[PDB]
Design a protein around this ligand. Sequence first.
Ligand SMILES: CC(C)(C)NC(=O)[C@@H]1C[C@@H]2CCCC[C@@H]2CN1C[C@@H](O)[C@H](Cc1ccccc1)NC(=O)[C@H](CC(N)=O)NC(=O)c1ccc2ccccc2n1
Lengths: 99, 99
Amino acid sequence: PQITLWKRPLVTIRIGGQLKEALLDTGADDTVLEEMNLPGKWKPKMIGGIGGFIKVRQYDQIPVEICGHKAIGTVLVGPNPVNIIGRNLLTQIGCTLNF
Amino acid sequence: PQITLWKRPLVTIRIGGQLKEALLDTGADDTVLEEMNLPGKWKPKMIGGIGGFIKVRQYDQIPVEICGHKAIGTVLVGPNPVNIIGRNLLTQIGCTLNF
Ligand SMILES: CC(C)(C)NC(=O)[C@@H]1C[C@@H]2CCCC[C@@H]2CN1C[C@@H](O)[C@H](Cc1ccccc1)NC(=O)[C@H](CC(N)=O)NC(=O)c1ccc2ccccc2n1
């Protein structure tokens, strides 16, 4: 699709069998989801944003389906008001910015 | 142009006639700049993201040219390490996400 930015670019994703709403975020290096259970091992990590750093759980090689397009990559899980799909998965689905 | 997401989408902007590097950021509602002492009135504002809220200075109707595409709007000045161009200006330059 082509998505404009008059509203937040929120889309539906599927992960671990569940549907969620997530923000397509070109400013985010990483994908950060709200606290949730995901299968498999995770590693404690920290990541930083506009307000400072938080602790997250790092899950590797997690399948995520984003508007029907498939990605498999690192998903971080931690305290967050919005699910954010970052460049690590946006690149996998061939997402670009155009103007 | 088309900006891919293999690296951070950093581009040149012009503000106050001077050139800066800034992140095209579809996950940002607002445009938030590194510390700079713009003339004129401003208002305090709180903005948040991962890690919490920060205090910023809000300046209105500031011209910002993004890769030669002119915009004008609100800019917030804060302690962040990178300038971010958010949807308030991305919409003005006709920027879309495409995949
Ligand atoms: C998500 C990770 C941590 C991987 N990346 C970022 O947060 C990066 C960090 C760099 C470096 C520091 C300066 C900021 C940049 C860019 N961000 C990415 C952003 O796109 C970031 C993503 C985000 C969106 C929503 C919540 C949390 C993170 N956007 C913001 O921080 C902006 C700042 C702003 N006011 O423009 N935020 C929001 O747009 C926003 C919308 C709604 C909302 C609701 C409740 C609480 C906060 C909040 N923030």
